[PDB]
Chain A
Amino acid sequence: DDFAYLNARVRVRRGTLLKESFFQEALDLSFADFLRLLSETVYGGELAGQGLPDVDRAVLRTQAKLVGDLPRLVTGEAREAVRLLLLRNDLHNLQALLRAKATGRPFEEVLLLPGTLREEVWRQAYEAQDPAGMAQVLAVPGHPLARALRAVLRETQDLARVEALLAKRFFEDVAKAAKGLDQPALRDYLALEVDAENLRTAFKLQGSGLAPDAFFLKGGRFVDRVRFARLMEGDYAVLDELSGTPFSGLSGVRDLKALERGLRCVLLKEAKKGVQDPLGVGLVLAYVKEREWEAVRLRLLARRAYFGLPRAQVEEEVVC
């Protein structure tokens, strides 16, 4: 409820962040220098041993320690708001769970990264006869995925098209809840994420020839459904049509790698606008996205040091 008592610990955690020189000096290391610098870092407090997998497990434990508590320590409308910040890992865990239930591998098959609800609920959801019964076992009150999967659950028993339509309805109900809050910037950031995901589905499905209206979603403000069909066709001018919006530098690109790189750049730049709101909740969302950019930078530098990457090989990864 209190968007300030959490904001104080948010400012404290914002005080615990690495500078750009911490990665700029990390452009030249040999994973032992990187291990020593991470040993200086707070994320190396869970530093178990040596090796890339130990480094990634320590990074996941540090992310759970510094980022997982934000889902806790709050109650009310602020809890309903801050729940829809670290939601991608939860939807990914639910998607892997649906894939495992439809596939047939072991319930300990996927590694089940940390999200919002109890992992014991995810273990208990491995055994459920009805999909609606599994949804009710996974039903939290303010979980948007619980309301999304139940509404999408009135089609069949367990289908992959049900899973894709459930992801579409998940993004749709996320946009509906983002419109259904008293937050001036969280709705804008969620809508920017929705339009970027629409562009990402368009670039991933460009040339597929499928139905774009079945692929296009609702909730954005930066593009059009006709612009969506133009992006579905081989027309980069629609990507050039993005002028004045946050999709500014996204122009003249056809390769999806640098396209989604600049998309993440625009998303992080919009997330940088969250420091303007010291009283609401978007500052905490900015802190979460900052830890996310730090996490991408950490696993990137970890891969670079473990495989000996060139500085030119990852030069397009720290430009913003």
Chain B
Amino acid sequence: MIAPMEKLVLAGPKGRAKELLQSLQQAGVVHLETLRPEALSAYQLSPEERAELRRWEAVSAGAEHTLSLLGLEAEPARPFPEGLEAAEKALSPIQAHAEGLTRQKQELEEELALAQAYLEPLERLAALAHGLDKSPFLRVIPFLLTEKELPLVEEALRKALEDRYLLAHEAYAGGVAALVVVHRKEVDQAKAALSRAGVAELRLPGALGELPLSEAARRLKERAEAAPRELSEVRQHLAKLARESASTLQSLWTRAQDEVARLKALEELASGRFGFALLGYVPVKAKPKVEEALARHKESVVYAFEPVDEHHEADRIPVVLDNPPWAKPFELLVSFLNTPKYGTFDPTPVVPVFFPFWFGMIVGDIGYALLFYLVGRWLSGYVKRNEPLVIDLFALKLKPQVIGKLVHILNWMVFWTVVWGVIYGEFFGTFLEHLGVFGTPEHPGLIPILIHRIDTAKTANLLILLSVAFGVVLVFFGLALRAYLGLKHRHMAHFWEGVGYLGGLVGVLALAASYLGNLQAGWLQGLMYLGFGVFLLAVLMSRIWLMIPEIFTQAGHILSHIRIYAVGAAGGILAGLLTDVGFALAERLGLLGVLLGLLVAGVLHLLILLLTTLGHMLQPIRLLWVEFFTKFGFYEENGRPYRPFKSVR
């Protein structure tokens, strides 16, 4: 249940306010508040404080860019208490070495790429350039072009100097290096005509397409011979600097983020003209820790913890879960939704109460349960490895707390799952075909089945009745929560509406089981009449015109609970069909391909599990969120959560 979450203020002097803010950020267990309006200043800190905050923020940004260029990620840790210029000096040398190494790495990589792109072509063109390197009479039209369509440009060469324009394409068969040479100006005109026919000059970047071809070939060969050892040494020194300074950079980034958060929190103060106040909210359970933080103020300049508001008008109230230790793991699934209205029904207990029960009713394969147990053992070994779960193509990065909550929820699911699977009597499907552990009157091998579930002639109406009873009970609980919350907020609209919907649902179930159900409608005719009268009376007392559409929608939400029994029967029939096919094709078809047939059947069963069990589990939580929340509302203004002072650590 949500805590009291009292509000609190304090005041003192401004330097006292900075010290108390540093302490209450070190004791970051209270969300803040604006409290702008009356008898106080805006508490605009200082231009000097703004400059120091901008300096620390730029320091944190530089540490972030340094980790990014280092490739490392911002992991929180214990900070480094140091001076601002001193931490800047510690940052600047490693950041400078890293920035220079990164620029040198990018430049050498692009240089090696451009060298390897035209290495042998420049060398072959230079070997062809042994007769006009820088001769001041004839240009050298180079064109590393496609395959031998040399006559298409030789038409333009015939348009050029006819018994001249030495033009051939020697080698380096990735591109025919068509070299043509006639003159300077007539060769410029012929290069224009050949580009009109389609041609391009070997225009490399930097100096290779800007120096003489022999010198460009020498420089390209030198860069190609030098770039590999330089790139290896660059990667080595970069990794060495990373492994040498990442902890210092991380501690600096932590201290910088902490100081910057303290500075941003200093923007939310409430000054008192050379003196200052502050206010916010915090839970009642940390009020001793709040007092322990309050002792560090100078004479403990007085903090007042005043009580929170009532069911009317608590919107800036912080939100928290505060569940039991048994109920602590169930909060993770509830976290996908929003937060309450500070007095709403925390339905987090019913989630662990029922979702595992319906999940165990869904899947009854004890072999798949043991597979889930082994997968939980693997996940538990990952948790004991204390490494965050990183899934690349799934983009699933997980801290160990959520994984441990998932594992605890999985164990709590698997307990009732094995319970209901023993109730259904199915071990990795129907092992009672091979080893008759389940007991039927048709072929009693061992212990009897409470639910046989292969036959629906005696079990289906009972399963449907069980699903309907669980659904009507949850619907009754949700409408009761709605009416009790309407009574708690003293707004008779919602409570009378829940009463009328509950009476209409009761009369609907009564009339259904009377007319469409069995005989003997005498005990329930007045019941259906009373339900209709309750619905009409709450319609008069409500006048919302929330019509029979709303009642029929609530009725469909109630009746939708049989999908649990449906999906359980579907998965059971599929598993039994696959298991019977595998056991038959193994044993009855030969009794020799039992390894091959059992392996193929188990692989198909694993494929069916991977295709079905995710949505099978999903339908219970879908039903839970679609029923227990929706009858109780849980879609009103989403609340405001407890955002205390971070101190990321």
Give A residues with C-beta under 8 Å from B.
129, 226, 229-230, 233, 235
Contact = CB atoms under 8 A, between A and B. Distances in A.
5 contacts: A129-B61, A226-B198, A229-B195, A230-B196, A235-B196
A229 B203 CA distance: 15
B195 A233 contact: yes
The 3 lowest CB-CB distance pairs between A and B, nearest first, are A226-B198, A129-B61, A230-B196
Interface of B: 61, 192, 195-196, 198
Nearest to A211: B203
Contacts of A235: 196
B103 to A, nearest CB: 12
A77 to B, nearest CB: 27
A235 B195 CA distance: 11
A48 B195 CA distance: 58
Contacts of B61: 129
A30 to B, nearest CB: 53
Chain B, interface SS category: helix
Contacts of B195: 229, 233
B141 to A, nearest CB: 16
Contacts of B192: 233
Contacts, number: 7
A226 B61 CA distance: 46
A228 to B, nearest CB: 13
B156 to A, nearest CB: 15
A135 B195 CA distance: 42
A229 B197 CA distance: 12
Contacts of A229: 195
Nearest to A237: B196
Nearest to B57: A129
A161 to B, nearest CB: 15
A129 B68 CA distance: 14
Nearest to B200: A229
A247 B192 CA distance: 25
A281 B61 CA distance: 47
Contacts of A226: 198
Nearest to A230: B196
Nearest to A234: B192
B625 to A, nearest CB: 24
A230 B198 CA distance: 9
A230 B195 CA distance: 9
B260 to A, nearest CB: 12
A226 B196 CA distance: 9
Contacts of A233: 192, 195
A150 to B, nearest CB: 15
Contacts of B196: 230, 235
B195 to A, nearest CB: 7
A233 B192 CA distance: 10
A226 B195 CA distance: 9
Nearest to B198: A226
A243 B192 CA distance: 23
Nearest to A235: B196
A269 B469 CA distance: 69
Nearest to A233: B195
A128 B196 CA distance: 49
A111 to B, nearest CB: 29
A252 B198 CA distance: 22
A63 B263 CA distance: 45
A229 B198 CA distance: 10
A223 to B, nearest CB: 15
A75 B61 CA distance: 41
A15 to B, nearest CB: 40
A230 B194 CA distance: 12
A229 to B, nearest CB: 8
Nearest to A229: B195
A185 to B, nearest CB: 34
A229 B196 CA distance: 10
Nearest to B65: A157
A294 B1 CA distance: 64
Nearest to B61: A129
A96 B277 CA distance: 42
A129 B260 CA distance: 14
A231 to B, nearest CB: 13
A235 B192 CA distance: 11
Contacts of A129: 61
A274 B648 CA distance: 59
A162 to B, nearest CB: 15
